[PDB]
Ligand binder design. Structure first.
Ligand SMILES: NC1=NC(=O)C2=N[C@H]3C(S)=C(S)[C@@H](COP(=O)(O)OP(=O)(O)OC[C@H]4O[C@@H](n5cnc6c(=O)[nH]c(N)nc65)[C@H](O)[C@@H]4O)O[C@H]3NC2=N1
Ligand SMILES: NC1=NC(=O)C2=N[C@H]3C(S)=C(S)[C@@H](COP(=O)(O)OP(=O)(O)OC[C@H]4O[C@@H](n5cnc6c(=O)[nH]c(N)nc65)[C@H](O)[C@@H]4O)O[C@H]3NC2=N1
Ligand SMILES: [Mo+4]
Ligand SMILES: [O]
Length: 771
């Protein structure tokens, strides 16, 4: 058996494995990693944990009755083990059946998910590759992270903006006077990357603190970001940031401080927004006093923040949680508007940034080539075919109905089958109880995972995939920085009967009479060497030298150099000469008023930043429930990933997902730290374990997304979730008609001490038949 050490990487970093007798015993972080993530140990554990899927399983119910099966028992664990040959025959037969009977419109292949890094083993791309061969599929658009923001930004600043390189960290260190983290926790969220992360924010953040720069954090939770800086902490009532931004704009007009020259030469439509702000259209002057009434943040604090921002070089780095809410589009729309009023856009250290908390945005880019991998075919091949990702349940329930998106109207397709790889829709999608009944509409549900997630438990057919550590691959290090290219080397042998997604899709393409079209005559290393060679020819033309494939593989990593990437300032050419370098909007300037959006006529998305009542907010007129659940991203998980590993022991409370509650709120309900609580609203009910702290502001509770749903009974509508899936409580509604994003953080609920029967958690052990 093997003994040695092997370097690879993941979403958490670059590391070195220790193999002892064919088993990975340790994962040590890369030596050049400036801030390793404590979650690496969990990543190793996920290879071997008890919820690891061993064999191909077919739902008992589906085996005997097929399309006539009772679809309400999905998730109950009654699975039949089958040979791989049987399972593959079944999946291909079923795919072809739905394509002949229903067409391409009957197959939903959006398969949303964070999967695993790697240009060869990209499961989601691989599934679309096979589905393209099978006749076609219905795809998904946008994502759950910036659902609202990515659609509205292009109407305002000209591009997406959220997934674009930021003004470099170094530039901030020498120039920024005030750093504002608005609804962002960069210490927490910078641990992972979409591709191998370099952890570039950490050094950037330390340079700021060493420099003495003033840092202001505007968030309901007392995060690690607040603690690292010992920052000034503004705690708004969740969902009231737009009011605050309006209040701050009012002061600025009220005391005549805003930058009139900036507004005049770089923006458009401001004079159509002024009336609104002054109260001339609705009789409600958007003052600090007015904003205080809605946000709960002292009026004078609001006036002082606005003055301090106008007289110092300020950077507003805003998170994305505040756009994962009803009317999400106004959050960043108002922040650009407020940034525009201060006049620092395009100045070194000033402006705003939407990616400083995500995937190393702000880390200087190198000049290395770009890496590419397997594609799904489409650019060389030949109802609606694309739906906004968060409208998947609506689709299912309303086949044929119309829907609005970015100014157009389309019809939902009539889907009969869902194929999901590398994602966890039974943990990530809002309103679990709505989705559970909606899934009954689907004839067949096929899932690939290596962990028995709530999504896998609910499948008709489940196939065991391997991790990234049981195969070979190549991937980039740094989403923005392009630090290097990594060889993701095989560590151990595929466990039990696990197989790569690629191998499973090759096999299914073969039964559709299309194998050579899927594989292209190449094997694993064949594909990897062709990606590397492509980048190497690219690098060569740009004067970046790169080893030959085997040389590169022997080293395992290639790093590229940094030339002028540490001097980059977002929006500097635009500010320097706006006529020569205009924005990509109709007017070519920052659009505070949108004629385009006004033409659309959407009630829930006016033509300028506007404050509207959300479906439900804390202390809102007629709100039924008292506490706001900050259903944010987890510290010790990557969404739902790593929940079924040893890491769960350090945060679970009585075996449940933790719930951070304020001492006053706990007293009132006679709740003691450590208790099991019932969290419920009109949508659903969950159990969690309480941690009492004054970190969370009064009126708000913290239950992170990612909890593995554990229903007491799948046949009982509204069954209590035993573990703690926060999406049992969220509502499933589009943000507005413009983007149709998800409102996953628009949740209100009530908490009580659980005094019911004892409960047995069953989600962290595999199904009896799967042992
Ligand atoms: N209430 C609410 N609040 C939120 O803030 C929130 N955040 C949202 C955001 S922005 C996101 S992007 C989503 C994420 O939801 P997402 O579906 O991306 O979640 P993951 O926990 O990363 O599940 C990915 C799955 O892929 C599996 N997997 C990984 N590699 C492979 C592989 O190669 N082969 C296959 N077959 N599978 C593998 C993992 O084991 C895991 O089960 O949640 C969203 N949902 C949210 N809900
Ligand atoms: N540790 C780790 N785990 C992850 O699961 C993870 N997910 C990744 C993904 S896909 C994405 S899309 C990004 C998302 O990064 P994103 O900005 O969406 O992060 P969140 O944790 O949902 O919210 C960040 C802060 O906003 C605060 N907040 C909540 N509601 C309000 C509000 O109404 N107003 C104010 N002012 N603040 C509020 C929260 O309390 C939280 O501290 O992070 C990425 N990074 C990740 N890191
Ligand atoms: Mo996301
Ligand atoms: O996402």
């Amino acid at each position: 058996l093997a003994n040695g050490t092997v370097m690879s990487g993941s979403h958490w970093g670059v590391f070195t494995a220790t193999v002892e007798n064919g088993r990975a015993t340790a994962f040590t972080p890369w030596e050049k990693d400036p801030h390793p993530s404590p979650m690496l140990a969990g990543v190793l554990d996920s290879i071997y944990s008890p919820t690891r899927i061993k064999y191909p399983m077919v739902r008992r119910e589906f085996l005997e009755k097929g399309v006539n099966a009772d679809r309400s028992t999905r998730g109950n664990g009654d699975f039949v083990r089958v040979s791989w040959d049987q399972a593959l025959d079944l999946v291909a037969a079923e795919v072809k059946r739905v394509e002949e009977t229903y067409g391409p419109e009957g197959v939903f292949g959006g398969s949303y998910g964070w999967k695993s890094p790697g240009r060869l083993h990209n499961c989601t791309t691989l599934l679309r590759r096979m589905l393209t061969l099978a006749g076609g599929y219905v795809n998904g658009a946008g994502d759950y992270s910036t659902g609202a923001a990515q659609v509205i930004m292009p109407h305002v600043v000209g591009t997406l903006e959220v997934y674009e390189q930021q003004t470099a960290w170094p530039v901030l260190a020498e120039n920024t006077e005030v750093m504002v983290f608005w609804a962002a926790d960069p210490i927490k969220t910078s641990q992972i990357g979409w591709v191998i992360p370099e952890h570039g924010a950490y050094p950037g953040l330390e340079a700021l603190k060493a420099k003495g720069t003033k840092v202001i954090v505007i968030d309901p939770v007392r995060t690690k970001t607040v603690e690292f800086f010992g920052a000034e902490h503004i705690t708004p009532k969740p969902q009231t940031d737009v009011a605050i931004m309006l209040g701050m704009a009012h002061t600025l007009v009220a005391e005549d401080l805003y930058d009139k020259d900036f507004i005049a030469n770089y923006t458009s439509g401001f004079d159509k927004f002024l009336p609104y702000l002054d109260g001339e259209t609705d009789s409600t002057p958007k003052t600090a006093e007015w904003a205080e009434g809605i946000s709960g943040v002292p009026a004078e604090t609001i006036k002082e923040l606005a003055r301090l921002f106008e007289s110092k070089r300020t950077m507003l780095a805003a998170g994305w949680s505040m756009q994962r809410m009803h009317h999400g589009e106004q959050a960043h729309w108002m922040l650009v508007t407020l940034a525009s009023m201060l006049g620092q856009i395009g100045l070194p250290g000033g402006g705003f940034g939407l990616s400083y908390h995500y995937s190393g945005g702000g880390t200087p880019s190198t000049s290395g080539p770009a890496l590419a991998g397997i594609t799904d075919g489409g650019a060389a091949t030949k109802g609606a075919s694309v739906i906004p990702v968060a409208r998947v349940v609506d689709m299912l329930e309303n086949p044929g109905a119309e829907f609005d998106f970015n100014g157009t109207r389309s019809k939902f397709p009539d889907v009969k089958m869902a194929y999901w790889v590398g994602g966890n829709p039974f943990v990530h999608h809002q309103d679990r109880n709505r989705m559970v009944k909606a899934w009954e509409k689907l004839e067949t549900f096929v899932v690939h995972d290596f962990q028995w997630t709530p999504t896998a438990r609910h499948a008709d057919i489940v196939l065991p995939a391997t991790t990234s550590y049981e195969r070979n691959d190549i991937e980039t290090i740094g989403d923005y920085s392009n630090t290097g290219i990594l060889a993701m080397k095989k560590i151990v042998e595929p466990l039990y009967e696990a197989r790569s997604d690629y191998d499973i899709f090759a096999a299914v393409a073969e039964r559709l009479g299309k194998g050579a079209e899927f594989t292209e005559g190449k094997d694993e290393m064949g594909w990897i060497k062709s990606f590397y060679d492509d980048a190497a020819k690219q690098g060569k033309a740009a004067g970046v030298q790169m080893p030959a494939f085997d040389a590169f593989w022997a080293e395992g990593i290639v790093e590229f150099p940094v030339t002028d990437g540490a001097d980059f300032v977002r929006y500097a050419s635009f500010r320097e000469d706006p006529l020569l370098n205009p924005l990509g909007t109709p007017t070519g300037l920052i659009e505070i008023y949108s004629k385009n959006i006004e033409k659309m006529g959407y009630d829930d998305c006016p033509a300028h930043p506007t404050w509207m009542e959300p479906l439900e907010r804390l202390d809102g007129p007629g709100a039924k429930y008292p506490l706001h659940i900050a259903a944010s991203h987890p510290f010790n998980r990557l969404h739902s990933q790593l929940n079924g590993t040893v890491l769960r022991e350090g945060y679970a409370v009585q075996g449940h997902e933790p719930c951070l509650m304020h001492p006053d709120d706990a007293a009132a309900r006679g709740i003691a730290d450590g208790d099991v609580v019932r969290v419920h609203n009109d949508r659903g009910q969950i159990l969690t374990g309480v941690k009492v702290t004054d970190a969370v502001m009064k009126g708000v509770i913290q239950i992170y997304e990612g909890g593995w749903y554990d229903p007491s009974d799948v046949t009982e509508p509204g069954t209590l979730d035993k573990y703690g899936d926060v999406n049992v409580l969220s509502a499933d509604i589009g943000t507005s008609k413009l983007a149709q994003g998800n409102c996953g953080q628009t949740v209100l609920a009530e908490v009580e001490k659980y005094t019911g029967p004892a409960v047995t958690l069953t989600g962290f052990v595999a199904p009896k038949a799967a042992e």
